[PDB]
RNA sequence: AACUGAAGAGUUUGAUCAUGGCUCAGAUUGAACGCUGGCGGCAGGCCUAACACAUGCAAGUCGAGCGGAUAAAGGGAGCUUGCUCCUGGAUUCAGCGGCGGACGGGUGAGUAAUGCCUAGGAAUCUGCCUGGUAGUGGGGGAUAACGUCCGGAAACGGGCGCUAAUACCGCAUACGUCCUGAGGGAGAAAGUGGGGGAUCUUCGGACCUCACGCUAUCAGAUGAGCCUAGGUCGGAUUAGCUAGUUGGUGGGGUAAAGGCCUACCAAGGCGACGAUCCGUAACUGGUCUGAGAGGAUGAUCAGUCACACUGGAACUGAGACACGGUCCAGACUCCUACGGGAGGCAGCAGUGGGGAAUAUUGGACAAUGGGCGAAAGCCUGAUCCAGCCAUGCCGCGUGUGUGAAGAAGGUCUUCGGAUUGUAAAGCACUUUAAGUUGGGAGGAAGGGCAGUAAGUUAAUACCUUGCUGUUUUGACGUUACCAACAGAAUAAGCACCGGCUAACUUCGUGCCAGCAGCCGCGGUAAUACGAAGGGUGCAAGCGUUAAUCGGAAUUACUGGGCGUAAAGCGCGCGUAGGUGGUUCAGCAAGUUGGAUGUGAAAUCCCCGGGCUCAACCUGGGAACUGCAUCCAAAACUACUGAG
């Protein structure tokens, strides 16, 4: 299956996720089909937490992309 | 995609051989050399002569080392 | 080791022995047709061809031979019966 | 690593005032700045041509208190920016926080201003900064923390502002002790003894 | 958003100009060693023996697939405090099954080629996902468990007897599937669970509905297999190499084109544009130097390939010729009742060995992810976190002010003094980090339970979904961070000082010991050896060694030379190849301009944004010089036609 899930970038104790669409049998930090947004939990000041783009998420979700548990709510809270 | 060369061989059976010249440039000295190319175009009717000027195109492989075919004979 | 690889080990011969019976049966009903061609037999091969088409295709949807392999014998063996006319 | 030791002795080799001692008592009375230091303080002659460029670079590097690992770091940010690396090298040494505390006049020496930053007594945007490398911007309201507004180190130093004047890119308020860094300096308030065409040429070869 | 650099010196000579070597100043490393040693962030840590391995752990999960045996609560009775039996039954897991172990983690042995990059295309496949479409009718024979017997030192093996399934196999039907020449012919399936109006009935059940699962098939994404063209290290003191070899035909074989394979036919194929052979090496996006052109190099991170003690081989399956699978042969350890067996850390730790040299037998599933079940849950040595090591980059401390009797004390001296030096001492203040005490976020999204509203329906029963209410969850952790208390207390070395090259004099030593990157010093006055004062460079580091690129216009495309410094074949003729006088005309292969597809993300660069700053993290752009397909222009080169 293909799936929409979260990567992990940044230092220790300061994460920064990436909404990628990947084949399911890959690594976390490995290859991907494309990337559509990010998610910053520790965003402070001028930083933006959610930055999903609704165009490609309209495209992939109509072709059987299968989201994760956190991405079940982050697309919902837009 | 369509190439052009001249025939050098008629020895095999239903199989012709072309020379495709080419001017590549040298990567560091800025000069256009000539370096050749020699294919095995699939002849079809055993009717080309040594010294022609023909036209080839690419198909699926027919034997091994023979994937190009013959479009048409341009000039003698 | 595991107590789960030793289960997939026992579960391999129970299918290896089972698939071999379903696989060799196909080949006996095909060699009956080919040995009947070589003796220039028109009606002997025609009877063997009739009762071997259902054996091949019923062994195709079980998943023993692939469905494009069963599509290949039926085309070629018809091409040798029309060459006896 | 700072420099802890004698401080007339640095002013005594380069042969200038250099503004290192604190009070307005006297130059060349605490110091005796007539000679090169050491035993052979009388013999002189023919500073080498390489030795002139190193003497100019070491002069600018001892006014402010940097070390060379930091100083080459400022030199990279000079050559990154657009145009006139000599002026840009100075304006990254003017915007540093231990300089601006000295320019406002919250200390006698420049090394006193380093200690007032280091003990969390200085704020920048309303929040505490204790780093003597903080590059301030245009319009940062440097103020003094209320727990130490009664220190005589700050009160006495404002009478030492009389022999200095205002540098006309700051403004200081002698009641609430809240300076305002107005804008960047120009290449007119800096003294002509420093040379922006010897330090740049030293870091080529 | 677009964006700038280029240094020289010493050494051949009585001295000079030139040619030409050598050596130094720079920035860098998975670095090692010597001296010295406060702190915290963010990083990295077997480059050598792919050399053997003690002991722990690294892939299992489903009782809403089916047997079986454990049988609670409770319903109890009875008998006299406890047992008896009964009744239901919640739990629980050895077995059959469905899935998954082909993903994730590790290492660089092999391979000089279509392996890997870039551009293309045609002959195929694809479990789980999405969109559809047509179904989900009936029937039979076995089998483990469990019995029981027999054999084995074990590791286990054998026999007879019994039972079930979504296990397995016929039969029935079928497009919108396969083959066929139209004509015609061939092929499937599995049920469990929540409910329930009516009705048949032991609501054993049928029944209706819902969720789930299964069977054909078309399309979409995703992954995979093939073919062409080009590029891809040194050696010419390696020049010929090859009979499935190179084509054709007939037949097989594989998901799929092909000498892939075979039977005859034919005598071809490649090669100085370097075949063949030898020697070494995993490639790539990138890193390190450079003003640039280039030159070396492929640690960590990412993509691709290749292996899993050595050599083979297939099965199972959607997809392996399979790191914790099977069979065989070999080598090597271990067990044994001597008959036979067992095992594979190039998974995480760890031991031995090698070596100039490289870390703890940690903590957890809370986070992000995977596998199974979607019902919660369960597994996870990949992940997220701690421990060790100045192994690197970036930041902060080791106090601040005043103070000349210019004190002792030291070294030198023309004996007058000079210098160490406001430096100390003395006096007045300051308390970050470290220490101590109190306080204290953010990483948490959910799950349970209850309620309610929507749509499913025959039945707002169940269930799905909004929402409400209530309750529960963190390895890190004594969290970052904040406040208070103590007091200047808790905290500086290392090389060098004749010239290149910043910085100097006395004392020992006398061709001895010794020094050294090059010039070269030392024979009794040494600014070069050994010390002492003084001084200069750098700092929590400083030095040497090893190794690349610069400087080297010293392999010169950008950017050199050949009368005498090294360098014009003894002279001809000439094949491949390189270059082409002059007018028109055509053409568009080069060439210029433009458009589209591509050039993975990271890295570098530019403008911003977050951590008290910076390193670090991160948003938007440019760039990736390329290759391909189209459109136009026609000066010059090419090709063509005429002079
Ligand atoms: Mg250069
Ligand atoms: Mg290990
Ligand atoms: Mg919390
Ligand atoms: Mg102290
Ligand atoms: Mg000496
Ligand atoms: Mg060069
Ligand atoms: Mg000639
Ligand atoms: Mg990129």
């Amino acid at each position: 299956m293909v799936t929409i899930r979260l990567a992990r970038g940044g230092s220790k104790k300061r994460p920064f996720y990436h909404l990628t669409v990947t084949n399911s049998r890959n690594a976390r930090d490995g290859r991907f089909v494309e990337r559509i947004g990010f998610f910053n939990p520790v965003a402070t000041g001028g930083e933006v937490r959610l930055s999903v783009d609704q165009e490609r998420a309209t495209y992939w979700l109509g072709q059987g992309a299968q989201p994760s548990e956190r991405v079940a709510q982050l697309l919902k809270d837009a | 995609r369509t190439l052009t060369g001249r025939v050098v061989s008629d020895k095999m059976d239903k199989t012709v051989t072309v020379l495709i010249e080419r001017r590549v440039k040298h990567p560091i000295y800025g000069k256009y050399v000539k370096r050749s190319t020699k294919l095995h175009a699939h002849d079809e009717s055993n009717q080309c002569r040594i010294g022609d000027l023909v036209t080839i195109r690419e198909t699926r492989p027919l034997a091994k080392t023979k994937a190009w075919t013959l479009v048409d004979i341009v000039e003698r | 080791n595991t107590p789960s690889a030793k289960k997939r080990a026992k579960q391999a011969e129970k299918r290896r022995s089972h698939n071999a019976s379903l696989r060799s049966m196909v080949r006996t009903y095909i060699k009956n047709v080919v040995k009947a061609i070589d003796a220039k037999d028109l009606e002997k091969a025609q009877a063997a061809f009739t009762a071997a088409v259902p054996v091949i295709d019923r062994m195709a949807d079980k998943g023993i031979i692939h469905k494009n392999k069963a599509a290949r014998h039926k085309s070629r063996l018809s091409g040798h019966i029309k060459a006896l006319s | 690593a700072r420099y802890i030791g004698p401080k007339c002795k640095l002013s005594r080799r380069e042969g200038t005032d250099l503004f290192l001692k604190s009070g307005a008592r006297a130059l060349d009375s605490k110091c005796k700045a007539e000679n090169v230091p050491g035993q052979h303080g009388q013999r002189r002659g023919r500073l080498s041509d390489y030795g002139l460029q190193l003497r100019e670079k070491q002069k600018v590097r001892r006014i402010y208190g940097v070390l060379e690992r930091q100083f080459r770091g400022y030199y990279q940010e000079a050559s990154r920016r657009k145009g006139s690396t000599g002026e840009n090298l100075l304006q990254l040494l003017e915007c540093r926080l231990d300089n601006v505390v000295y320019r406002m006049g919250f200390g006698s020496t420049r090394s006193e201003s380093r200690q007032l930053v280091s003990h969390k007594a200085i704020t920048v945007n309303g929040q505490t900064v204790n780093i003597p490398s903080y590059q301030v911007k245009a319009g940062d309201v440097v103020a003094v923390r209320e727990k130490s507004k009664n220190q005589l180190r700050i009160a006495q130093a404002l009478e030492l502002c009389g022999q200095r004047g205002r540098v006309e890119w700051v403004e200081v308020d002698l009641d609430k002790k809240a300076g305002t860094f107005k804008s960047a300096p120009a290449r007119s308030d800096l003294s002509a003894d420093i040379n922006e065409n010897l330090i740049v040429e030293l870091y080529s070869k």
mmCIF file with all atom_site columns, all heavy atoms in Angstrom, chain E residues 313-318:
data_model
loop_
_atom_site.group_PDB
_atom_site.id
_atom_site.type_symbol
_atom_site.label_atom_id
_atom_site.label_alt_id
_atom_site.label_comp_id
_atom_site.label_asym_id
_atom_site.label_entity_id
_atom_site.label_seq_id
_atom_site.pdbx_PDB_ins_code
_atom_site.Cartn_x
_atom_site.Cartn_y
_atom_site.Cartn_z
_atom_site.occupancy
_atom_site.B_iso_or_equiv
_atom_site.pdbx_formal_charge
_atom_site.auth_seq_id
_atom_site.auth_comp_id
_atom_site.auth_asym_id
_atom_site.auth_atom_id
_atom_site.pdbx_PDB_model_num
ATOM 1   P P     . A E 1 313 ? 23.855 -24.085 -8.793  1.00 0.00 ? 313 A E P     1
ATOM 2   O OP1   . A E 1 313 ? 23.893 -24.164 -10.268 1.00 0.00 ? 313 A E OP1   1
ATOM 3   O OP2   . A E 1 313 ? 23.909 -22.763 -8.137  1.00 0.00 ? 313 A E OP2   1
ATOM 4   O "O5'" . A E 1 313 ? 22.544 -24.838 -8.314  1.00 0.00 ? 313 A E "O5'" 1
ATOM 5   C "C5'" . A E 1 313 ? 22.343 -26.196 -8.657  1.00 0.00 ? 313 A E "C5'" 1
ATOM 6   C "C4'" . A E 1 313 ? 21.310 -26.839 -7.778  1.00 0.00 ? 313 A E "C4'" 1
ATOM 7   O "O4'" . A E 1 313 ? 21.776 -26.881 -6.412  1.00 0.00 ? 313 A E "O4'" 1
ATOM 8   C "C3'" . A E 1 313 ? 19.980 -26.128 -7.685  1.00 0.00 ? 313 A E "C3'" 1
ATOM 9   O "O3'" . A E 1 313 ? 19.148 -26.415 -8.792  1.00 0.00 ? 313 A E "O3'" 1
ATOM 10  C "C2'" . A E 1 313 ? 19.415 -26.655 -6.379  1.00 0.00 ? 313 A E "C2'" 1
ATOM 11  O "O2'" . A E 1 313 ? 18.831 -27.927 -6.583  1.00 0.00 ? 313 A E "O2'" 1
ATOM 12  C "C1'" . A E 1 313 ? 20.675 -26.846 -5.541  1.00 0.00 ? 313 A E "C1'" 1
ATOM 13  N N9    . A E 1 313 ? 20.872 -25.794 -4.535  1.00 0.00 ? 313 A E N9    1
ATOM 14  C C8    . A E 1 313 ? 21.829 -24.828 -4.490  1.00 0.00 ? 313 A E C8    1
ATOM 15  N N7    . A E 1 313 ? 21.749 -24.061 -3.436  1.00 0.00 ? 313 A E N7    1
ATOM 16  C C5    . A E 1 313 ? 20.667 -24.564 -2.749  1.00 0.00 ? 313 A E C5    1
ATOM 17  C C6    . A E 1 313 ? 20.056 -24.201 -1.550  1.00 0.00 ? 313 A E C6    1
ATOM 18  N N6    . A E 1 313 ? 20.465 -23.187 -0.795  1.00 0.00 ? 313 A E N6    1
ATOM 19  N N1    . A E 1 313 ? 18.993 -24.910 -1.135  1.00 0.00 ? 313 A E N1    1
ATOM 20  C C2    . A E 1 313 ? 18.575 -25.926 -1.884  1.00 0.00 ? 313 A E C2    1
ATOM 21  N N3    . A E 1 313 ? 19.074 -26.363 -3.027  1.00 0.00 ? 313 A E N3    1
ATOM 22  C C4    . A E 1 313 ? 20.124 -25.634 -3.406  1.00 0.00 ? 313 A E C4    1
ATOM 23  P P     . A E 1 314 ? 18.503 -25.229 -9.650  1.00 0.00 ? 314 A E P     1
ATOM 24  O OP1   . A E 1 314 ? 18.160 -25.785 -10.973 1.00 0.00 ? 314 A E OP1   1
ATOM 25  O OP2   . A E 1 314 ? 19.395 -24.055 -9.544  1.00 0.00 ? 314 A E OP2   1
ATOM 26  O "O5'" . A E 1 314 ? 17.136 -24.903 -8.903  1.00 0.00 ? 314 A E "O5'" 1
ATOM 27  C "C5'" . A E 1 314 ? 15.935 -25.566 -9.264  1.00 0.00 ? 314 A E "C5'" 1
ATOM 28  C "C4'" . A E 1 314 ? 15.320 -26.273 -8.085  1.00 0.00 ? 314 A E "C4'" 1
ATOM 29  O "O4'" . A E 1 314 ? 16.260 -26.300 -6.991  1.00 0.00 ? 314 A E "O4'" 1
ATOM 30  C "C3'" . A E 1 314 ? 14.079 -25.635 -7.494  1.00 0.00 ? 314 A E "C3'" 1
ATOM 31  O "O3'" . A E 1 314 ? 12.913 -26.006 -8.208  1.00 0.00 ? 314 A E "O3'" 1
ATOM 32  C "C2'" . A E 1 314 ? 14.087 -26.147 -6.062  1.00 0.00 ? 314 A E "C2'" 1
ATOM 33  O "O2'" . A E 1 314 ? 13.540 -27.450 -6.003  1.00 0.00 ? 314 A E "O2'" 1
ATOM 34  C "C1'" . A E 1 314 ? 15.578 -26.246 -5.765  1.00 0.00 ? 314 A E "C1'" 1
ATOM 35  N N9    . A E 1 314 ? 16.083 -25.100 -4.996  1.00 0.00 ? 314 A E N9    1
ATOM 36  C C8    . A E 1 314 ? 16.881 -24.094 -5.447  1.00 0.00 ? 314 A E C8    1
ATOM 37  N N7    . A E 1 314 ? 17.189 -23.212 -4.538  1.00 0.00 ? 314 A E N7    1
ATOM 38  C C5    . A E 1 314 ? 16.546 -23.674 -3.418  1.00 0.00 ? 314 A E C5    1
ATOM 39  C C6    . A E 1 314 ? 16.476 -23.184 -2.121  1.00 0.00 ? 314 A E C6    1
ATOM 40  N N6    . A E 1 314 ? 17.088 -22.071 -1.742  1.00 0.00 ? 314 A E N6    1
ATOM 41  N N1    . A E 1 314 ? 15.759 -23.874 -1.217  1.00 0.00 ? 314 A E N1    1
ATOM 42  C C2    . A E 1 314 ? 15.149 -24.991 -1.610  1.00 0.00 ? 314 A E C2    1
ATOM 43  N N3    . A E 1 314 ? 15.145 -25.551 -2.813  1.00 0.00 ? 314 A E N3    1
ATOM 44  C C4    . A E 1 314 ? 15.868 -24.836 -3.677  1.00 0.00 ? 314 A E C4    1
ATOM 45  P P     . C E 1 315 ? 11.606 -25.075 -8.208  1.00 0.00 ? 315 C E P     1
ATOM 46  O OP1   . C E 1 315 ? 10.733 -25.523 -9.316  1.00 0.00 ? 315 C E OP1   1
ATOM 47  O OP2   . C E 1 315 ? 12.033 -23.658 -8.163  1.00 0.00 ? 315 C E OP2   1
ATOM 48  O "O5'" . C E 1 315 ? 10.875 -25.428 -6.839  1.00 0.00 ? 315 C E "O5'" 1
ATOM 49  C "C5'" . C E 1 315 ? 10.349 -26.721 -6.593  1.00 0.00 ? 315 C E "C5'" 1
ATOM 50  C "C4'" . C E 1 315 ? 10.121 -26.936 -5.123  1.00 0.00 ? 315 C E "C4'" 1
ATOM 51  O "O4'" . C E 1 315 ? 11.318 -26.560 -4.403  1.00 0.00 ? 315 C E "O4'" 1
ATOM 52  C "C3'" . C E 1 315 ? 9.034  -26.087 -4.495  1.00 0.00 ? 315 C E "C3'" 1
ATOM 53  O "O3'" . C E 1 315 ? 7.738  -26.614 -4.683  1.00 0.00 ? 315 C E "O3'" 1
ATOM 54  C "C2'" . C E 1 315 ? 9.463  -26.013 -3.036  1.00 0.00 ? 315 C E "C2'" 1
ATOM 55  O "O2'" . C E 1 315 ? 9.108  -27.199 -2.354  1.00 0.00 ? 315 C E "O2'" 1
ATOM 56  C "C1'" . C E 1 315 ? 10.985 -25.983 -3.165  1.00 0.00 ? 315 C E "C1'" 1
ATOM 57  N N1    . C E 1 315 ? 11.536 -24.609 -3.112  1.00 0.00 ? 315 C E N1    1
ATOM 58  C C2    . C E 1 315 ? 11.874 -24.093 -1.875  1.00 0.00 ? 315 C E C2    1
ATOM 59  O O2    . C E 1 315 ? 11.704 -24.793 -0.877  1.00 0.00 ? 315 C E O2    1
ATOM 60  N N3    . C E 1 315 ? 12.379 -22.848 -1.795  1.00 0.00 ? 315 C E N3    1
ATOM 61  C C4    . C E 1 315 ? 12.546 -22.118 -2.894  1.00 0.00 ? 315 C E C4    1
ATOM 62  N N4    . C E 1 315 ? 13.046 -20.892 -2.781  1.00 0.00 ? 315 C E N4    1
ATOM 63  C C5    . C E 1 315 ? 12.213 -22.608 -4.172  1.00 0.00 ? 315 C E C5    1
ATOM 64  C C6    . C E 1 315 ? 11.725 -23.841 -4.223  1.00 0.00 ? 315 C E C6    1
ATOM 65  P P     . U E 1 316 ? 6.572  -25.662 -5.224  1.00 0.00 ? 316 U E P     1
ATOM 66  O OP1   . U E 1 316 ? 5.405  -26.484 -5.596  1.00 0.00 ? 316 U E OP1   1
ATOM 67  O OP2   . U E 1 316 ? 7.180  -24.762 -6.225  1.00 0.00 ? 316 U E OP2   1
ATOM 68  O "O5'" . U E 1 316 ? 6.178  -24.804 -3.950  1.00 0.00 ? 316 U E "O5'" 1
ATOM 69  C "C5'" . U E 1 316 ? 5.691  -25.439 -2.784  1.00 0.00 ? 316 U E "C5'" 1
ATOM 70  C "C4'" . U E 1 316 ? 5.731  -24.515 -1.599  1.00 0.00 ? 316 U E "C4'" 1
ATOM 71  O "O4'" . U E 1 316 ? 7.100  -24.127 -1.340  1.00 0.00 ? 316 U E "O4'" 1
ATOM 72  C "C3'" . U E 1 316 ? 5.010  -23.193 -1.761  1.00 0.00 ? 316 U E "C3'" 1
ATOM 73  O "O3'" . U E 1 316 ? 3.616  -23.283 -1.589  1.00 0.00 ? 316 U E "O3'" 1
ATOM 74  C "C2'" . U E 1 316 ? 5.696  -22.327 -0.722  1.00 0.00 ? 316 U E "C2'" 1
ATOM 75  O "O2'" . U E 1 316 ? 5.227  -22.657 0.570   1.00 0.00 ? 316 U E "O2'" 1
ATOM 76  C "C1'" . U E 1 316 ? 7.136  -22.813 -0.835  1.00 0.00 ? 316 U E "C1'" 1
ATOM 77  N N1    . U E 1 316 ? 7.953  -21.967 -1.735  1.00 0.00 ? 316 U E N1    1
ATOM 78  C C2    . U E 1 316 ? 8.548  -20.880 -1.169  1.00 0.00 ? 316 U E C2    1
ATOM 79  O O2    . U E 1 316 ? 8.428  -20.607 0.000   1.00 0.00 ? 316 U E O2    1
ATOM 80  N N3    . U E 1 316 ? 9.298  -20.119 -2.004  1.00 0.00 ? 316 U E N3    1
ATOM 81  C C4    . U E 1 316 ? 9.510  -20.334 -3.337  1.00 0.00 ? 316 U E C4    1
ATOM 82  O O4    . U E 1 316 ? 10.212 -19.559 -3.967  1.00 0.00 ? 316 U E O4    1
ATOM 83  C C5    . U E 1 316 ? 8.866  -21.476 -3.867  1.00 0.00 ? 316 U E C5    1
ATOM 84  C C6    . U E 1 316 ? 8.138  -22.231 -3.063  1.00 0.00 ? 316 U E C6    1
ATOM 85  P P     . G E 1 317 ? 2.649  -22.946 -2.820  1.00 0.00 ? 317 G E P     1
ATOM 86  O OP1   . G E 1 317 ? 1.265  -23.213 -2.389  1.00 0.00 ? 317 G E OP1   1
ATOM 87  O OP2   . G E 1 317 ? 3.193  -23.594 -4.033  1.00 0.00 ? 317 G E OP2   1
ATOM 88  O "O5'" . G E 1 317 ? 2.767  -21.375 -2.975  1.00 0.00 ? 317 G E "O5'" 1
ATOM 89  C "C5'" . G E 1 317 ? 2.185  -20.516 -2.008  1.00 0.00 ? 317 G E "C5'" 1
ATOM 90  C "C4'" . G E 1 317 ? 2.974  -19.244 -1.843  1.00 0.00 ? 317 G E "C4'" 1
ATOM 91  O "O4'" . G E 1 317 ? 4.388  -19.526 -1.952  1.00 0.00 ? 317 G E "O4'" 1
ATOM 92  C "C3'" . G E 1 317 ? 2.740  -18.172 -2.887  1.00 0.00 ? 317 G E "C3'" 1
ATOM 93  O "O3'" . G E 1 317 ? 1.565  -17.428 -2.642  1.00 0.00 ? 317 G E "O3'" 1
ATOM 94  C "C2'" . G E 1 317 ? 4.013  -17.349 -2.791  1.00 0.00 ? 317 G E "C2'" 1
ATOM 95  O "O2'" . G E 1 317 ? 3.973  -16.517 -1.648  1.00 0.00 ? 317 G E "O2'" 1
ATOM 96  C "C1'" . G E 1 317 ? 5.050  -18.431 -2.534  1.00 0.00 ? 317 G E "C1'" 1
ATOM 97  N N9    . G E 1 317 ? 5.697  -18.868 -3.774  1.00 0.00 ? 317 G E N9    1
ATOM 98  C C8    . G E 1 317 ? 5.346  -19.861 -4.652  1.00 0.00 ? 317 G E C8    1
ATOM 99  N N7    . G E 1 317 ? 6.165  -19.965 -5.659  1.00 0.00 ? 317 G E N7    1
ATOM 100 C C5    . G E 1 317 ? 7.096  -18.969 -5.415  1.00 0.00 ? 317 G E C5    1
ATOM 101 C C6    . G E 1 317 ? 8.234  -18.574 -6.135  1.00 0.00 ? 317 G E C6    1
ATOM 102 O O6    . G E 1 317 ? 8.666  -19.043 -7.187  1.00 0.00 ? 317 G E O6    1
ATOM 103 N N1    . G E 1 317 ? 8.893  -17.525 -5.521  1.00 0.00 ? 317 G E N1    1
ATOM 104 C C2    . G E 1 317 ? 8.506  -16.931 -4.366  1.00 0.00 ? 317 G E C2    1
ATOM 105 N N2    . G E 1 317 ? 9.266  -15.934 -3.937  1.00 0.00 ? 317 G E N2    1
ATOM 106 N N3    . G E 1 317 ? 7.455  -17.282 -3.681  1.00 0.00 ? 317 G E N3    1
ATOM 107 C C4    . G E 1 317 ? 6.818  -18.296 -4.264  1.00 0.00 ? 317 G E C4    1
ATOM 108 P P     . A E 1 318 ? 0.595  -17.038 -3.855  1.00 0.00 ? 318 A E P     1
ATOM 109 O OP1   . A E 1 318 ? -0.648 -16.465 -3.304  1.00 0.00 ? 318 A E OP1   1
ATOM 110 O OP2   . A E 1 318 ? 0.531  -18.187 -4.777  1.00 0.00 ? 318 A E OP2   1
ATOM 111 O "O5'" . A E 1 318 ? 1.355  -15.862 -4.604  1.00 0.00 ? 318 A E "O5'" 1
ATOM 112 C "C5'" . A E 1 318 ? 0.719  -15.147 -5.650  1.00 0.00 ? 318 A E "C5'" 1
ATOM 113 C "C4'" . A E 1 318 ? 1.393  -13.827 -5.924  1.00 0.00 ? 318 A E "C4'" 1
ATOM 114 O "O4'" . A E 1 318 ? 1.179  -12.917 -4.815  1.00 0.00 ? 318 A E "O4'" 1
ATOM 115 C "C3'" . A E 1 318 ? 2.901  -13.863 -6.072  1.00 0.00 ? 318 A E "C3'" 1
ATOM 116 O "O3'" . A E 1 318 ? 3.329  -14.300 -7.348  1.00 0.00 ? 318 A E "O3'" 1
ATOM 117 C "C2'" . A E 1 318 ? 3.281  -12.426 -5.779  1.00 0.00 ? 318 A E "C2'" 1
ATOM 118 O "O2'" . A E 1 318 ? 2.990  -11.602 -6.894  1.00 0.00 ? 318 A E "O2'" 1
ATOM 119 C "C1'" . A E 1 318 ? 2.301  -12.076 -4.665  1.00 0.00 ? 318 A E "C1'" 1
ATOM 120 N N9    . A E 1 318 ? 2.840  -12.244 -3.292  1.00 0.00 ? 318 A E N9    1
ATOM 121 C C8    . A E 1 318 ? 2.156  -11.736 -2.236  1.00 0.00 ? 318 A E C8    1
ATOM 122 N N7    . A E 1 318 ? 2.667  -11.945 -1.062  1.00 0.00 ? 318 A E N7    1
ATOM 123 C C5    . A E 1 318 ? 3.803  -12.673 -1.339  1.00 0.00 ? 318 A E C5    1
ATOM 124 C C6    . A E 1 318 ? 4.785  -13.216 -0.488  1.00 0.00 ? 318 A E C6    1
ATOM 125 N N6    . A E 1 318 ? 4.799  -13.061 0.833   1.00 0.00 ? 318 A E N6    1
ATOM 126 N N1    . A E 1 318 ? 5.827  -13.862 -1.019  1.00 0.00 ? 318 A E N1    1
ATOM 127 C C2    . A E 1 318 ? 5.845  -14.010 -2.330  1.00 0.00 ? 318 A E C2    1
ATOM 128 N N3    . A E 1 318 ? 4.983  -13.557 -3.233  1.00 0.00 ? 318 A E N3    1
ATOM 129 C C4    . A E 1 318 ? 3.939  -12.884 -2.702  1.00 0.00 ? 318 A E C4    1
#
